[PDB]
Amino acid sequence: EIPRESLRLEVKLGQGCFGEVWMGTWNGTTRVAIKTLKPGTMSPEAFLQEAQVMKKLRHEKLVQLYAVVSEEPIYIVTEYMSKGSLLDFLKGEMGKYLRLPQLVDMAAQIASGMAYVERMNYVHRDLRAANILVGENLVCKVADFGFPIKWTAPEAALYGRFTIKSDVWSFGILLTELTTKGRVPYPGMVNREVLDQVERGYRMPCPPECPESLHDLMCQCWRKDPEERPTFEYLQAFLEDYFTSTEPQYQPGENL
Protein backbone atom coordinates (compact mmCIF):
# COMPACT_ATOMS: atom_id res chain seq x y z
CA GLU A 1 0.00 0.00 0.00
CA ILE A 2 1.12 3.56 -0.77
CA PRO A 3 -0.04 7.16 -0.14
CA ARG A 4 -2.43 7.99 -3.00
CA GLU A 5 -0.85 11.46 -3.02
CA SER A 6 2.45 10.17 -4.41
CA LEU A 7 0.55 9.01 -7.49
CA ARG A 8 -0.23 11.16 -10.52
CA LEU A 9 -2.58 10.06 -13.30
CA GLU A 10 -1.43 11.83 -16.46
CA VAL A 11 -3.03 10.17 -19.48
CA LYS A 12 -5.97 7.79 -19.69
CA LEU A 13 -5.01 4.72 -21.74
CA GLY A 14 -8.41 3.04 -21.81
CA GLN A 15 -11.61 2.26 -19.93
CA GLY A 16 -13.20 -1.08 -19.11
CA CYS A 17 -16.31 -2.46 -17.45
CA PHE A 18 -14.70 -2.67 -13.99
CA GLY A 19 -12.49 0.41 -14.08
CA GLU A 20 -9.85 2.30 -16.03
CA VAL A 21 -6.15 2.43 -16.88
CA TRP A 22 -3.90 5.50 -16.72
CA MET A 23 -0.28 6.32 -17.45
CA GLY A 24 1.31 8.39 -14.71
CA THR A 25 4.11 8.94 -12.24
CA TRP A 26 5.15 7.82 -8.76
CA ASN A 27 7.33 9.91 -6.44
CA GLY A 28 7.85 12.07 -9.51
CA THR A 29 10.69 9.74 -10.53
CA THR A 30 8.86 6.69 -11.82
CA ARG A 31 6.62 6.15 -14.84
CA VAL A 32 3.87 3.71 -13.94
CA ALA A 33 0.48 2.52 -15.09
CA ILE A 34 -2.44 2.97 -12.69
CA LYS A 35 -5.50 0.71 -12.87
CA THR A 36 -8.64 1.96 -11.16
CA LEU A 37 -11.47 -0.23 -9.88
CA LYS A 38 -14.75 1.59 -10.51
CA PRO A 39 -16.62 1.30 -7.17
CA GLY A 40 -19.56 -1.08 -6.79
CA THR A 41 -18.19 -3.70 -9.17
CA MET A 42 -16.11 -5.59 -6.61
CA SER A 43 -16.25 -5.78 -2.83
CA PRO A 44 -13.07 -4.10 -1.53
CA GLU A 45 -12.04 -6.70 1.07
CA ALA A 46 -12.71 -9.34 -1.60
CA PHE A 47 -10.53 -7.85 -4.33
CA LEU A 48 -8.20 -7.12 -1.41
CA GLN A 49 -7.28 -10.78 -0.98
CA GLU A 50 -7.14 -11.87 -4.60
CA ALA A 51 -4.65 -9.02 -4.93
CA GLN A 52 -2.28 -10.42 -2.29
CA VAL A 53 -1.76 -13.32 -4.69
CA MET A 54 -0.73 -10.84 -7.39
CA LYS A 55 2.16 -9.86 -5.10
CA LYS A 56 3.55 -13.37 -4.72
CA LEU A 57 3.98 -14.01 -8.46
CA ARG A 58 7.16 -12.47 -9.88
CA HIS A 59 8.32 -13.31 -13.39
CA GLU A 60 9.93 -11.55 -16.35
CA LYS A 61 6.87 -12.27 -18.49
CA LEU A 62 4.24 -11.25 -15.95
CA VAL A 63 3.36 -7.56 -15.76
CA GLN A 64 4.82 -6.58 -12.39
CA LEU A 65 2.66 -5.14 -9.61
CA TYR A 66 4.42 -2.16 -8.05
CA ALA A 67 2.03 -0.88 -5.38
CA VAL A 68 -1.61 -0.54 -4.37
CA VAL A 69 -4.06 1.94 -2.88
CA SER A 70 -6.58 0.33 -0.54
CA GLU A 71 -9.07 3.21 -0.47
CA GLU A 72 -11.85 3.37 -3.06
CA PRO A 73 -11.51 3.96 -5.83
CA ILE A 74 -8.84 1.26 -5.63
CA TYR A 75 -5.56 2.00 -7.39
CA ILE A 76 -3.36 -0.77 -8.72
CA VAL A 77 0.13 0.50 -9.52
CA THR A 78 1.89 -1.76 -12.01
CA GLU A 79 4.63 -1.52 -14.63
CA TYR A 80 4.02 0.51 -17.77
CA MET A 81 3.87 -1.31 -21.10
CA SER A 82 4.35 1.38 -23.74
CA LYS A 83 2.78 -0.50 -26.67
CA GLY A 84 -0.45 -1.25 -24.80
CA SER A 85 -2.29 -4.51 -25.40
CA LEU A 86 -1.22 -7.16 -27.89
CA LEU A 87 -4.63 -7.10 -29.60
CA ASP A 88 -4.30 -3.35 -30.12
CA PHE A 89 -0.72 -3.88 -31.24
CA LEU A 90 -1.76 -6.54 -33.77
CA LYS A 91 -4.79 -4.63 -35.05
CA GLY A 92 -2.72 -1.47 -35.43
CA GLU A 93 0.08 -0.24 -37.70
CA MET A 94 2.54 -2.98 -36.87
CA GLY A 95 0.23 -5.87 -37.75
CA LYS A 96 1.05 -5.26 -41.40
CA TYR A 97 4.78 -5.67 -40.71
CA LEU A 98 4.87 -8.51 -38.18
CA ARG A 99 5.80 -11.85 -39.67
CA LEU A 100 5.82 -15.40 -38.32
CA PRO A 101 9.15 -15.15 -36.47
CA GLN A 102 7.95 -12.11 -34.50
CA LEU A 103 4.59 -13.73 -33.80
CA VAL A 104 6.06 -17.11 -32.82
CA ASP A 105 8.52 -15.12 -30.71
CA MET A 106 5.74 -13.30 -28.88
CA ALA A 107 3.86 -16.57 -28.33
CA ALA A 108 6.90 -18.21 -26.75
CA GLN A 109 7.21 -15.34 -24.25
CA ILE A 110 3.60 -15.76 -23.25
CA ALA A 111 4.08 -19.52 -23.01
CA SER A 112 7.05 -18.61 -20.82
CA GLY A 113 5.07 -16.47 -18.40
CA MET A 114 2.37 -19.13 -18.37
CA ALA A 115 4.88 -21.91 -17.74
CA TYR A 116 5.80 -19.96 -14.60
CA VAL A 117 2.15 -19.67 -13.58
CA GLU A 118 1.95 -23.40 -14.32
CA ARG A 119 4.81 -24.12 -11.91
CA MET A 120 3.26 -21.87 -9.27
CA ASN A 121 0.16 -24.09 -9.14
CA TYR A 122 -1.81 -21.07 -10.34
CA VAL A 123 -4.33 -20.48 -13.11
CA HIS A 124 -5.05 -17.40 -15.23
CA ARG A 125 -8.64 -18.00 -16.34
CA ASP A 126 -8.77 -15.24 -18.94
CA LEU A 127 -6.00 -15.82 -21.45
CA ARG A 128 -6.42 -13.87 -24.70
CA ALA A 129 -4.61 -11.22 -26.74
CA ALA A 130 -6.49 -8.46 -24.88
CA ASN A 131 -4.72 -9.48 -21.66
CA ILE A 132 -1.20 -9.59 -23.10
CA LEU A 133 0.66 -6.30 -22.76
CA VAL A 134 3.46 -5.29 -25.13
CA GLY A 135 6.47 -3.16 -24.20
CA GLU A 136 9.66 -2.23 -26.05
CA ASN A 137 11.36 -4.55 -28.57
CA LEU A 138 8.35 -6.89 -28.77
CA VAL A 139 8.44 -7.70 -25.07
CA CYS A 140 5.09 -9.32 -24.27
CA LYS A 141 3.79 -9.89 -20.75
CA VAL A 142 0.74 -11.58 -19.24
CA ALA A 143 -1.51 -9.18 -17.31
CA ASP A 144 -4.95 -8.87 -15.71
CA PHE A 145 -5.53 -12.20 -13.96
CA GLY A 146 -9.18 -13.26 -14.21
CA PHE A 147 -17.61 -13.05 -21.49
CA PRO A 148 -14.92 -14.38 -23.88
CA ILE A 149 -16.65 -17.68 -24.67
CA LYS A 150 -14.56 -18.19 -27.81
CA TRP A 151 -11.33 -18.16 -25.76
CA THR A 152 -12.70 -20.53 -23.11
CA ALA A 153 -12.40 -24.32 -23.02
CA PRO A 154 -15.65 -26.36 -23.19
CA GLU A 155 -15.31 -27.93 -19.73
CA ALA A 156 -14.67 -24.49 -18.22
CA ALA A 157 -17.49 -22.59 -19.93
CA LEU A 158 -20.04 -25.28 -19.09
CA TYR A 159 -18.93 -26.95 -15.86
CA GLY A 160 -16.66 -24.28 -14.37
CA ARG A 161 -13.65 -26.59 -14.46
CA PHE A 162 -10.95 -23.93 -14.71
CA THR A 163 -7.46 -25.41 -14.81
CA ILE A 164 -4.01 -24.64 -16.17
CA LYS A 165 -5.18 -26.93 -18.97
CA SER A 166 -8.07 -24.63 -19.76
CA ASP A 167 -5.47 -21.88 -20.15
CA VAL A 168 -3.71 -24.14 -22.63
CA TRP A 169 -6.93 -24.16 -24.65
CA SER A 170 -7.03 -20.35 -24.42
CA PHE A 171 -3.44 -20.23 -25.55
CA GLY A 172 -4.18 -22.24 -28.66
CA ILE A 173 -6.85 -19.65 -29.44
CA LEU A 174 -4.39 -16.84 -28.74
CA LEU A 175 -2.18 -18.50 -31.36
CA THR A 176 -4.84 -17.91 -34.00
CA GLU A 177 -5.10 -14.23 -33.03
CA LEU A 178 -1.37 -13.98 -33.71
CA THR A 179 -1.45 -15.85 -37.02
CA THR A 180 -4.45 -13.75 -38.08
CA LYS A 181 -3.04 -10.45 -36.78
CA GLY A 182 -5.80 -9.62 -34.29
CA ARG A 183 -8.84 -11.12 -35.98
CA VAL A 184 -11.65 -12.49 -33.83
CA PRO A 185 -11.79 -16.28 -33.26
CA TYR A 186 -14.43 -18.31 -35.08
CA PRO A 187 -15.20 -15.56 -37.62
CA GLY A 188 -18.90 -15.42 -38.50
CA MET A 189 -20.02 -17.36 -35.43
CA VAL A 190 -21.75 -15.96 -32.36
CA ASN A 191 -20.92 -17.40 -28.94
CA ARG A 192 -23.82 -19.85 -28.86
CA GLU A 193 -23.01 -21.05 -32.37
CA VAL A 194 -19.39 -21.43 -31.23
CA LEU A 195 -20.31 -23.26 -28.04
CA ASP A 196 -22.48 -25.73 -29.97
CA GLN A 197 -20.02 -26.33 -32.83
CA VAL A 198 -17.01 -26.93 -30.60
CA GLU A 199 -19.05 -29.46 -28.60
CA ARG A 200 -19.66 -31.44 -31.79
CA GLY A 201 -15.93 -31.55 -32.53
CA TYR A 202 -15.51 -28.45 -34.64
CA ARG A 203 -12.15 -26.72 -34.44
CA MET A 204 -10.79 -23.71 -36.32
CA PRO A 205 -8.90 -24.69 -39.50
CA CYS A 206 -5.47 -23.53 -40.65
CA PRO A 207 -5.35 -19.73 -40.94
CA PRO A 208 -4.15 -18.48 -44.34
CA GLU A 209 -0.37 -18.60 -44.78
CA CYS A 210 -0.11 -20.49 -41.48
CA PRO A 211 2.05 -23.65 -41.45
CA GLU A 212 0.39 -26.98 -40.57
CA SER A 213 3.04 -27.62 -37.92
CA LEU A 214 1.84 -24.51 -36.08
CA HIS A 215 -1.84 -25.34 -36.57
CA ASP A 216 -1.21 -28.84 -35.22
CA LEU A 217 0.03 -27.29 -31.97
CA MET A 218 -3.21 -25.33 -31.76
CA CYS A 219 -5.27 -28.51 -32.12
CA GLN A 220 -3.21 -30.08 -29.32
CA CYS A 221 -4.23 -27.14 -27.14
CA TRP A 222 -7.77 -27.85 -28.36
CA ARG A 223 -8.06 -31.48 -27.28
CA LYS A 224 -11.35 -32.42 -25.66
CA ASP A 225 -9.53 -34.14 -22.81
CA PRO A 226 -7.80 -31.54 -20.57
CA GLU A 227 -4.97 -33.75 -19.27
CA GLU A 228 -4.09 -34.52 -22.90
CA ARG A 229 -3.30 -30.89 -23.73
CA PRO A 230 0.44 -30.11 -23.53
CA THR A 231 1.99 -28.12 -20.67
CA PHE A 232 3.21 -24.54 -21.04
CA GLU A 233 6.71 -25.84 -20.45
CA TYR A 234 6.25 -27.92 -23.61
CA LEU A 235 4.71 -25.09 -25.61
CA GLN A 236 7.44 -22.69 -24.50
CA ALA A 237 10.20 -25.02 -25.73
CA PHE A 238 8.40 -25.97 -28.95
CA LEU A 239 7.91 -22.34 -29.93
CA GLU A 240 11.47 -21.31 -29.05
CA ASP A 241 12.88 -24.08 -31.27
CA TYR A 242 10.26 -23.62 -33.98
CA PHE A 243 12.30 -22.41 -36.96
CA THR A 244 15.22 -24.76 -36.26
CA SER A 245 13.52 -28.01 -35.22
CA THR A 246 10.10 -27.66 -36.86
CA GLU A 247 10.11 -25.16 -39.73
CA PRO A 248 13.73 -24.66 -40.85
CA GLN A 249 12.57 -24.37 -44.46
CA TYR A 250 10.36 -21.42 -43.51
CA GLN A 251 10.13 -18.59 -46.04
CA PRO A 252 8.44 -15.19 -45.47
CA GLY A 253 5.23 -14.58 -47.42
CA GLU A 254 2.87 -11.67 -48.00
CA ASN A 255 1.55 -11.59 -44.43
CA LEU A 256 3.25 -14.36 -42.48
Binding site: Q15, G16, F18, E20, K35, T36, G84, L87, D88, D144
Partner: peptide
Protein backbone atom coordinates in the same frame (compact mmCIF):
# COMPACT_ATOMS: atom_id res chain seq x y z
CA UNK B 1 -11.09 -5.70 -18.28
CA UNK B 2 -9.53 -2.74 -16.20
CA UNK B 3 -8.27 -1.30 -19.67
CA UNK B 4 -9.06 -3.51 -24.96
Amino acid sequence: XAXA
